Protein backbone atom coordinates (compact mmCIF):
# COMPACT_ATOMS: atom_id res chain seq x y z
CA UNK A 1 0.00 0.00 0.00
CA UNK A 2 1.58 3.23 -1.23
CA UNK A 3 -0.12 6.60 -1.03
CA UNK A 4 0.60 9.12 -3.79
CA UNK A 5 3.01 11.87 -2.74
CA UNK A 6 1.12 14.69 -1.05
CA UNK A 7 -2.20 12.80 -0.97
CA UNK A 8 -4.24 11.48 1.94
CA UNK A 9 -6.78 9.72 -0.32
CA UNK A 10 -5.10 8.36 -3.45
CA UNK A 11 -3.02 5.20 -3.34
CA UNK A 12 -1.84 2.08 -5.08
CA UNK A 13 -2.36 -1.41 -3.71
CA UNK A 14 -1.40 -4.68 -5.41
CA UNK A 15 -0.64 -2.69 -8.59
CA UNK A 16 -4.13 -1.13 -8.82
CA UNK A 17 -5.13 2.48 -8.17
CA UNK A 18 -7.72 3.26 -5.47
CA UNK A 19 -8.99 6.16 -3.43
CA UNK A 20 -10.38 6.43 0.09
CA UNK A 21 -14.02 7.50 -0.15
CA UNK A 22 -16.22 9.43 2.26
CA UNK A 23 -18.47 6.34 2.60
CA UNK A 24 -18.16 5.22 6.22
CA UNK A 25 -18.52 1.52 7.02
CA UNK A 26 -19.94 0.62 10.46
CA UNK A 27 -17.60 -1.56 12.53
CA UNK A 28 -20.21 -4.32 12.61
CA UNK A 29 -19.97 -4.64 8.81
CA UNK A 30 -16.19 -4.95 8.75
CA UNK A 31 -14.75 -8.45 8.45
CA UNK A 32 -11.29 -9.91 7.82
CA UNK A 33 -8.25 -7.73 7.22
CA UNK A 34 -6.73 -8.30 3.76
CA UNK A 35 -3.65 -6.11 4.15
CA UNK A 36 -1.81 -4.94 7.24
CA UNK A 37 -0.16 -1.50 7.13
CA UNK A 38 0.14 1.61 9.30
CA UNK A 39 0.60 5.15 8.02
CA UNK A 40 0.39 8.45 9.85
CA UNK A 41 -0.38 11.62 7.93
CA UNK A 42 -0.62 15.18 9.19
CA UNK A 43 -2.90 17.37 7.09
CA UNK A 44 -3.40 21.12 7.09
CA UNK A 45 -7.19 21.50 7.14
CA UNK A 46 -7.11 24.78 5.21
CA UNK A 47 -4.67 23.95 2.42
CA UNK A 48 -5.24 20.17 2.63
CA UNK A 49 -1.48 19.90 2.27
CA UNK A 50 0.61 17.31 4.10
CA UNK A 51 2.62 18.61 7.07
CA UNK A 52 5.70 17.26 8.85
CA UNK A 53 4.31 18.34 12.23
CA UNK A 54 0.92 19.44 13.56
CA UNK A 55 -0.29 23.06 13.51
CA UNK A 56 -3.32 25.07 14.62
CA UNK A 57 -5.39 24.01 11.61
CA UNK A 58 -4.09 20.46 11.18
CA UNK A 59 -5.66 17.04 11.59
CA UNK A 60 -3.71 13.83 12.22
CA UNK A 61 -4.80 10.73 10.33
CA UNK A 62 -3.83 7.21 11.21
CA UNK A 63 -4.36 4.95 8.17
CA UNK A 64 -4.48 1.37 9.33
CA UNK A 65 -5.12 -1.82 7.35
CA UNK A 66 -7.43 -2.75 4.50
CA UNK A 67 -10.44 -4.91 5.38
CA UNK A 68 -13.11 -6.76 3.46
CA UNK A 69 -16.61 -5.58 4.40
CA UNK A 70 -19.74 -7.77 4.61
CA UNK A 71 -20.79 -6.77 1.07
CA UNK A 72 -17.35 -7.83 -0.24
CA UNK A 73 -16.27 -4.23 -0.84
CA UNK A 74 -12.92 -3.14 0.64
CA UNK A 75 -12.39 -0.51 3.32
CA UNK A 76 -9.59 1.18 5.20
CA UNK A 77 -9.14 1.96 8.87
CA UNK A 78 -9.00 5.73 9.30
CA UNK A 79 -8.49 6.83 12.90
CA UNK A 80 -11.40 5.26 14.80
CA UNK A 81 -13.55 4.58 11.72
CA UNK A 82 -13.63 2.58 8.49
CA UNK A 83 -14.09 4.06 5.03
CA UNK A 84 -14.82 2.28 1.77
CA UNK A 85 -12.11 2.35 -0.87
CA UNK A 86 -12.93 2.36 -4.60
CA UNK A 87 -10.98 2.11 -7.86
CA UNK A 88 -9.96 5.48 -9.32
CA UNK A 89 -12.33 4.76 -12.20
CA UNK A 90 -15.01 5.81 -9.69
CA UNK A 91 -13.51 9.23 -8.82
CA UNK A 92 -16.11 11.99 -8.89
CA UNK A 93 -19.00 9.50 -8.75
CA UNK A 94 -18.34 9.04 -5.05
CA UNK A 95 -16.70 11.81 -2.99
CA UNK A 96 -13.24 11.27 -1.56
CA UNK A 97 -12.67 11.15 2.20
CA UNK A 98 -13.48 14.46 3.90
CA UNK A 99 -10.91 15.86 6.35
CA UNK A 100 -13.73 17.57 8.25
CA UNK A 101 -14.89 14.16 9.50
CA UNK A 102 -12.01 14.19 11.98
CA UNK A 103 -19.16 23.47 2.32
CA UNK A 104 -19.96 20.18 0.61
CA UNK A 105 -22.79 21.51 -1.55
CA UNK A 106 -23.21 23.46 -4.78
CA UNK A 107 -24.24 27.11 -4.52
CA UNK A 108 -24.43 29.72 -7.26
CA UNK A 109 -21.86 32.37 -6.36
CA UNK A 110 -23.51 35.44 -4.81
CA UNK A 111 -21.18 37.89 -6.53
CA UNK A 112 -20.83 36.38 -10.01
CA UNK A 113 -23.70 34.31 -11.41
CA UNK A 114 -21.35 32.63 -13.90
CA UNK A 115 -19.59 30.93 -10.99
CA UNK A 116 -20.42 28.14 -8.58
CA UNK A 117 -19.11 27.68 -5.04
CA UNK A 118 -18.23 24.14 -3.95
CA UNK A 119 -16.03 22.72 -1.17
CA UNK A 120 -14.48 26.10 -0.40
CA UNK A 121 -13.52 26.57 -4.03
CA UNK A 122 -14.96 28.72 -6.83
CA UNK A 123 -15.77 27.25 -10.23
CA UNK A 124 -16.21 29.06 -13.51
CA UNK A 125 -19.06 27.87 -15.76
CA UNK A 126 -17.63 27.85 -19.27
CA UNK A 127 -19.25 27.86 -22.70
CA UNK A 128 -17.85 24.34 -23.29
CA UNK A 129 -20.42 21.56 -23.70
CA UNK A 130 -20.15 18.35 -21.70
CA UNK A 131 -21.17 15.49 -24.01
CA UNK A 132 -23.50 12.70 -22.89
CA UNK A 133 -20.56 10.27 -22.85
CA UNK A 134 -18.58 12.59 -20.53
CA UNK A 135 -21.58 13.19 -18.26
CA UNK A 136 -21.45 11.10 -15.10
CA UNK A 137 -23.18 10.73 -11.75
CA UNK A 138 -26.16 12.95 -10.81
CA UNK A 139 -25.18 15.10 -7.83
CA UNK A 140 -27.94 17.67 -7.29
CA UNK A 141 -30.38 19.96 -9.00
CA UNK A 142 -30.22 23.73 -8.64
CA UNK A 143 -33.49 24.66 -10.40
CA UNK A 144 -32.58 28.33 -10.06
CA UNK A 145 -32.72 31.41 -12.19
CA UNK A 146 -30.28 34.31 -12.42
CA UNK A 147 -30.71 37.40 -14.53
CA UNK A 148 -27.39 39.20 -14.54
CA UNK A 149 -25.33 41.90 -16.18
CA UNK A 150 -23.90 40.23 -19.28
CA UNK A 151 -20.44 41.72 -18.75
CA UNK A 152 -19.95 41.78 -14.96
CA UNK A 153 -22.00 38.76 -13.90
CA UNK A 154 -23.76 40.67 -11.12
CA UNK A 155 -27.29 39.43 -10.56
CA UNK A 156 -30.38 41.56 -10.79
CA UNK A 157 -33.14 41.05 -8.20
CA UNK A 158 -36.46 39.65 -9.41
CA UNK A 159 -38.23 42.87 -8.44
CA UNK A 160 -36.34 44.67 -11.23
CA UNK A 161 -36.76 42.16 -14.07
CA UNK A 162 -27.02 47.55 -19.46
CA UNK A 163 -27.14 44.22 -21.27
CA UNK A 164 -28.75 41.36 -19.34
CA UNK A 165 -28.44 37.58 -19.57
CA UNK A 166 -30.77 34.96 -18.08
CA UNK A 167 -29.40 31.57 -17.05
CA UNK A 168 -31.69 28.80 -15.91
CA UNK A 169 -29.67 26.34 -13.83
CA UNK A 170 -30.61 22.67 -13.85
CA UNK A 171 -28.84 19.52 -12.69
CA UNK A 172 -25.24 19.11 -11.58
CA UNK A 173 -23.38 15.95 -12.62
CA UNK A 174 -19.92 14.59 -12.12
CA UNK A 175 -17.75 14.31 -15.21
CA UNK A 176 -16.48 10.75 -15.79
CA UNK A 177 -12.81 10.42 -14.91
CA UNK A 178 -12.66 13.62 -12.86
CA UNK A 179 -13.14 14.33 -9.17
CA UNK A 180 -15.81 16.96 -8.39
CA UNK A 181 -13.03 19.09 -6.92
CA UNK A 182 -11.47 19.16 -10.41
CA UNK A 183 -14.55 19.80 -12.53
CA UNK A 184 -18.23 19.12 -12.85
CA UNK A 185 -21.09 19.67 -15.29
CA UNK A 186 -23.83 22.26 -14.82
CA UNK A 187 -27.04 22.34 -16.82
CA UNK A 188 -27.43 25.90 -18.15
CA UNK A 189 -30.60 26.44 -20.16
CA UNK A 190 -30.66 23.50 -22.58
CA UNK A 191 -27.23 21.95 -22.22
CA UNK A 192 -24.57 20.82 -19.83
CA UNK A 193 -21.59 23.15 -19.49
CA UNK A 194 -18.13 22.44 -18.07
CA UNK A 195 -17.32 24.06 -14.72
CA UNK A 196 -13.67 24.21 -13.65
CA UNK A 197 -11.83 25.47 -10.57
CA UNK A 198 -10.71 29.09 -10.87
Shared-domain flag, residues 98 and 108: no
Residue 87 neighbours by CB under 8 Å, 6+ apart? 16, 17, 18
Q: Which of 99, 110, 124 is nearest to 155 (CA)?
A: 110
Q: Are residues 126 and 146 in the same domain?
A: yes
Question: At which of 102, 132, 151 does a domain end?
Answer: 102
Are both 91 and 146 inside the same structural domain? no
Q: Are residues 25 and 83 in the same domain?
A: yes
Q: Confirm if 157 and 172 have CB atoms less than 8 A apart.
A: no
Note whether 52 and 118 are same-domain residues.
no
Closest CA to 174 of 125, 121, 137: 137
**One domain, residues 92 and 110:** no
Say if CB 177 and CB 198 are below 8 A apart.
Answer: no
- Resolution value, angstrom units: 1.9
For residues 144 and 188, the answer to whether their CB atoms sit within 8 Å is: no
Amino acid sequence: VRFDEGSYTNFIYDNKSYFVTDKEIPQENVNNSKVKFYKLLIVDMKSEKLLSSSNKNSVTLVLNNIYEASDKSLCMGINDRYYKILPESDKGAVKALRLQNFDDNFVIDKNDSRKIDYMGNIYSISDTTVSDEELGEYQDVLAEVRVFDSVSGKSIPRSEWQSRTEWDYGEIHSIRGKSLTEAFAVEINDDFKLATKV
